[PDB]
Amino acid sequence: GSSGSSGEPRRPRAGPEELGKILQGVVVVLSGFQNPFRSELRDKALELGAKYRPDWTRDSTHLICAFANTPKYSQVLGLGGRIVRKEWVLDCHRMRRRLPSQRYLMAGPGSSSEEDEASHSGGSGPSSG
Numbered sequence: 001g002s003s004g005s006s007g008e009p010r011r012p013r014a015g016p017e018e019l020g021k022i023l024q025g026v027v028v029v030l031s032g033f034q035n036p037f038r039s040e041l042r043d044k045a046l047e048l049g050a051k052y053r054p055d056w057t058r059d060s061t062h063l064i065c066a067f068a069n070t071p072k073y074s075q076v077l078g079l080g081g082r083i084v085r086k087e088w089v090l091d092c093h094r095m096r097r098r099l100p101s102q103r104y105l106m107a108g109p110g111s112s113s114e115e116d117e118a119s120h121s122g123g124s125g126p127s128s129g
Contacts, residue, residue, distance in 0.1 A: 006125055016126045087104055
C-alpha cells in the first residue's frame with residue numbers, strides 16, 4: 001500500500017499535469033530497453049500519465065517494443081494487446097499531445113473498433129520517490 005501526501009508550489013510552466021491528461025487511463029510496458037534510454041523512455045511515459053509495468057499485465061493496454069522479432073512481441077500478439085512502437089511515446093512527449101497509435105501499429109490487422117466508455121485512474125503522485 002501507499003499513502004497519498006504531497007504539497008508544494010510548482011513552476012507556472014506546463015508541468016506533468018498537462019501531459020498526464022494525454023495518456024490518462026493508459027498502461028505502457030517497456031520491452032527491450034536499456035538505460036539510460038530505458039530510464040528516459042520510462043519517465044516520458046509517466047509524464048503522459050501512463051502506467052509503467054515491469055511486465056505484461058492484465059491491465060496493459062499498449063506495449064512499447066524497441067524492435068520486432070522479440071519474445072515479448074509474439075506473446076502480447078497472440079493475447080490481443082495493442083503492440084506499438086516507441087515512436088508513439090517519444091512523439092507524444094516531444095509534442096506533449098495525444099497521437100493516434102493506429103499509425104504506429106506494429107501488429108494486428110487494425111483497430112477493431114475497440115473504444116472505451118469509462119475507465120479508472122489513480123496515482124496522484126508522478127514523483128516516483
